């Protein structure tokens, strides 16, 4: 035994499953219709909505 | 709304599995000798230009003055080709051996292998093999051209041993996750005439450089009016320690040896990359010609 | 093939509808995504989209700044898209006050890592540098998404605002007082081949010169002291190989009257810049003169 | 600063000197960047001292 | 003594790393690769004196 101790620390990760309660009409989101943008390539004209 | 394309047919009865083999080569670069509107399959790629007698840089020179189309769509009985224009962006599949990233300047190169390879399972015919040029980035292409130039510089005294280990040091080249090996320009202990002309023109312009400019700046020293030309002869004397029609012949020889160097002293960037697809198979890039 | 299809008027995209509308109107359906006007369709400028860590996105929240990637002999961080102002610490052109100013906003690890990689090479700068264009919209992530433009103008979405190129005043340089109708812009990197330093000077020249040779003969006439330093360093140290005294590449072209002085504010370090209002990027290769 | 043509010697002179670039040995400016230029002339000889005990006698 | 302490610790040499990849490693880089098999999961520890 040498002349000092070792206080080791270690983190531990646990996958878990929350439950959320919230009252009626907590936040009131406002949305609009989705707009479409084009993005030209030669072969694959992607569209972002 | 039909676009400006190039139609290309086939002469041989190609099967359906060959069509499925071909439709993986959508966004592949294809050279054409002359921009027609219709073209047979004997003028599609490098197998009409490949030559055992002349050297490899002749394939670059006969790739310098081409038109580099793109395969638009593979269908029955005809192959669509889309000739690019300067400014519009396209998609090129990474037919080369080396990975691409964002923003590289891309140059076109003849392939450094012909005949047997593990990745040369290209479209074959009876005598025809469609072979694509290589699309490698700019500093790698300049490195390959410089390595080939100094390896053709040692073709005369290959019999020694330190130059041998220097050559097999030179023949290997490492790039970004690509252990790369070029072939040797000396086969059966005689160099081909194209490399001989290239390095001979290089040695010619270097020898006229060592021969003429001492006399020329010694004449220009009497017409001195500045300082940037009066110490260049001084550094010439630092390193160093006829008929005038022969001098005209020396200047004209120097300039034609300059003009016989444009295949190797420079190259034009052809593509530069905007985006690269994941797993690096294709990468959408603009054209720049 | 008749006398009507060729004699028809050429097709305008502003007359007919989109692809999605003429697709869904044939099958008679309607969905929530309104597709009657596709955005970014009349965007002739070529965009791009890069990722950049938060150490380099300072002076980039406002749109419009030159964006250069650099080469590094490493494997994973091999390319780093640094701003033009990140080059401003390394220029011998820049003054003292803005040098200590804009370094005090470039405090993160990646910025000083770029500053280290700009001086930890045996080579010179320009062979490791390639240009990418100008940024027009940032997204404020942790690795912020940003939309660079390779070729074309610099405008906001729906083209309700034309963004501008911002270059700081000490890097700005003109070579004539009679500025012509158009003046192209050029990225000039000139080296100063002194003994204790190979620290270059950075200039973003604006000039009305188009042809190359009539630019380089006045470039040698304006930077002849740098050529004197170059031939000095070639003449005092043999077995040392120099290259590319000055490097010039084409950056684009402007309209020659919208050049007005201005300032960009970010974390209240106001920095005097030069504003090219409606500038269209047009990249070119790094040409090297002697 | 000593001068032999007129035997008028100046004793206390402020000089701000610095290394100029491109293997610059030494250049001696004034307080106003005047680059005083006495050491061109044949009539002078000059002695320079540092804030340390380093010492230059200049012809 | 560094060679002996690397032999006694199990960790091998720093393999004469490139002078530019030190800036890489201080910028941030994953170095230690995976093991051959893991029937438990990812490891975690630390130490204090």
Q: Which residues of A touch C38 (CB under 8 A)?
A: 36-38, 47
Contacting E with CB below 8 Å, chain A residues are 4, 6-13
Nearest to C281 by CA among C107, C154, C159: C154
Cα–Cα distances in Å, from B27 out to B82, B90, B91, B228?
10, 9, 6, 52
- Are residues C72 and E20, on separate chains, in Cβ contact within 8 Å? yes
Nearest to B79 by CA among B23, B21, B136, B16: B23
B38-39 and B6-8 strand pairing: parallel
| B81 Cβ contact partners less than 8 Å away, ≥ 6 residues apart | B5, B6, B7, B8, B30, B32, B39, B69, B70, B71, B72
Interface test with C, best of E21, E27, E29 (most C CBs within 10 A): E27
Least Cα distance to C138 among C79, C68, C52, C55 occurs for C52
CB contact set of D20 (below 8 Å; sequence gap of 6+): D26, D27
* Interface residues on E facing A, Cβ-Cβ cutoff 8 A: 42, 44-49
| Two structure tokens written together for B252 | 């004209």
- String of DSSP letters for B166-177: HHHHHHEEEETT
Cα–Cα distance, C102 to C91 (Å, whole number): 13
State the structure-solving technique.
cryo-EM
Cα B95 from Cα B78, distance rounded (Å): 22
CB contact under 8 A, A12 and E44: yes
Tokens of B135: 């699309």
Resolution of the experimental structure, in angstroms: 4.1
Beta bridge partners of C70: C80, C129
φ, ψ of residue B282 in degrees (nearest 5): -125, 165
Give the start-end residues of each E strand in chain B: 6-8, 29-32, 38-39, 67-74, 79-82, 89-93, 105-109, 134-137, 172-175, 178-181, 271-273, 282-287
CB atoms within 10 A of CB B121: 8
A 10 A CB-CB count for A5 gives 9
User: Which residue in chain E has the smallest CA separation from A6?
Assistant: E49
Residues of E in contact with C76 (CB under 8 A): 24, 29
Q: Give A-chain residues touching C33 at CB under 8 angstroms.
A: 33-34, 36, 49
The answer for residues whose C-beta is within 8 angstroms of residue A10's C-beta and 6 or more apart is: E44, E45, E46
Q: With residue C259 as reference, give the H or E element that holds it.
A: strand C259-264
Contact B89 A43 (CB under 8 A): no
- The three-state DSSP-derived secondary structure of C166-196 is EEECCCEEECCCCCCCCCEEEEEEECCCCCC
CA distance E39 to E32: 19
Q: Which chain E residue is nearest to residue C111, measuring alpha carbons?
A: E27
Dist CA C132 CA B136 (whole Å): 19
Q: Among residues 114-153 of chain C, which lie with CB inside 8 Å of chain E?
A: 116-117, 120
Q: Is the minimum CB–CB distance between E18 and chain C shorter than 8 Å?
A: yes
Residue B216 DSSP SS3: helix
Q: Does D have 3 or more CB contacts under 8 Å with E?
A: no
Token pair 């390779």 is found at: C150
Give C28: exposed, middle or buried? Use CB within 10 Å, 0-12, 13-18, 19+: exposed
CA dihedral B97, B100, B105, B111 (to 10 degrees): 10
Going from the C-alpha of B1 to that of each of A40, B37, B137, C118, D2, the distances in angstroms are 16, 18, 35, 50, 92
- Residues comprising chain B, all counted: 289
């Amino acid at each position: 035994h040498p002349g000092f101790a070792l206080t080791a620390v270690r983190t531990d990760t646990f996958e878990v499953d929350m439950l959320l309660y919230s009252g009626k009409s907590c936040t009131s989101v406002i949305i609009n219709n989705p707009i479409v943008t084009k993005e030209e390539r030669d072969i694959s004209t992607t569209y972002h909505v | 709304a039909m676009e400006a394309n190039i139609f290309c047919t086939f002469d041989h009865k190609l099967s359906i599995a060959d069509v499925g083999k071909l439709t993986k080569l959508v966004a592949a670069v294809v050279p054409i000798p002359q921009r027609l509107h219709l073209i047979k399959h004997y003028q599609l790629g490098l197998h009409q230009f490949v030559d055992h007698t002349r050297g490899y840089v002749r394939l670059r020179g006969l790739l310098r003055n081409m038109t580099l189309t793109l395969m638009r769509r593979v269908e029955g009985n005809q192959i669509l080709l889309h000739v690019p224009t300067h400014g519009l962006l396209y998609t090129v599949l990474n037919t080369g051996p080396v990975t691409w990233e964002k923003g590289d300047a891309l140059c076109v190169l003849p392939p450094l292998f012909h005949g047997p390879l593990a990745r040369e399972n290209l479209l074959t015919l009876g005598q025809w093999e469609l072979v694509l040029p290589w699309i490698v980035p700019m500093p790698l292409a300049l490195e390959i051209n410089q390595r080939l130039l100094i390896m053709g510089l040692f073709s005369l005294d290959r019999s020694y041993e330190e130059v041998k280990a220097a050559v097999q040091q030179l023949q290997t080249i490492t790039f970004r996750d690509a252990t790369f090996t070029i072939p040797d320009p000396v086969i059966d202990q005689h160099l081909l005439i194209d490399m001989k002309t290239a390095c001979l023109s290089m040695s010619m312009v270097a020898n006229l450089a060592s021969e003429l400019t001492m006399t020329y700046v010694r004449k220009l020293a009497l017409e001195d009016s500045s300082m940037l030309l009066v110490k260049c002869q001084e550094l010439l004397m630092r390193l160093d320690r006829v008929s005038p029609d022969d001098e005209i012949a020396r200047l004209s020889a120097l300039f034609v040896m300059l003009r016989q160097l444009d295949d190797l002293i420079r190259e034009q960037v052809v593509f530069t990359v905007c985006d690269v697809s994941p797993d690096n198979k294709s990468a959408t890039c603009i054209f720049k010609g | 093939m008749d006398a009507r299809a060729v004699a028809k008027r050429p097709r305008d995209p502003a007359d007919e509808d989109n692809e999605l509308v003429t697709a869904l109107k044939a099958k008679r359906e309607v969905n929530t995504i309104s597709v009657r006007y596709l955005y970014h369709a009349d965007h002739q400028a070529l965009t791009a989209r890069f990722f950049v860590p938060e150490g380099l996105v300072e002076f980039e929240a406002q749109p419009g700044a030159l964006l250069i990637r650099m080469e590094t002999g490493c494997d994973s961080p091999r390319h780093l898209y640094i701003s033009l102002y990140l080059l401003g610490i390394r220029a011998s052109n820049v003054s003292a006050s803005t040098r200590c100013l804009l370094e005090s906003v470039y405090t993160a690890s990646a910025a000083r890592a770029a500053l280290q990689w700009l001086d930890l090479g045996p080579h010179l700068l320009h062979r490791r540098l390639e240009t990418l264009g100008c940024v027009k919209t940032v997204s404020l992530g942790i690795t912020s998404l940003l939309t660079c433009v390779m070729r074309g103008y610099l405008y906001n979405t729906l083209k309700t605002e034309v963004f501008a190129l911002m270059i700081p005043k000490d890097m700005y340089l003109t070579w004539e007082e009679t500025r012509g109708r158009l003046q192209y812009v050029y990225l000039i990197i000139v080296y100063d081949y002194d003994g204790p330093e190979t620290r270059p000077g950075i200039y973003v020249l604006t000039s009305s010169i188009a042809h190359w040779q009539t630019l380089v003969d006045v470039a040698r006439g304006k930077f002849a002291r740098e050529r004197c330093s170059f031939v000095n360093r070639r003449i005092t140290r043999p077995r040392q190989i120099p290259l590319c005294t000055g490097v010039i590449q084409k950056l684009g072209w402007c309209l020659a009257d919208d050049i007005h002085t201005s300032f960009l504010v970010h974390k209240e370090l106001k920095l005097s810049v030069v504003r090219l209002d409606n500038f269209s990027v047009e990249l070119g290769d790094f040409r090297e003169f002697v | 600063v000593v001068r032999c043509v007129r035997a008028q010697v100046d004793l206390g002179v402020e000089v701000r000197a610095a290394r100029c670039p491109r293997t610059g040995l030494w250049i001696v400016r004034d307080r106003r960047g005047r680059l005083r230029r006495w050491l061109s002339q044949p009539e002078v000889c000059v002695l320079y001292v540092t804030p340390d005990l380093d010492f230059y006698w200049v012809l | 003594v560094d060679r002996w302490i690397r032999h006694a610790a199990g960790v091998e040499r720093p393999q004469l790393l490139d002078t530019e990849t030190i800036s890489m490693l201080t910028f941030g880089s994953m170095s230690e690769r995976n093991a051959a098999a893991t029937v438990h999961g990812q490891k975690a520890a630390c130490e204090l004196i």
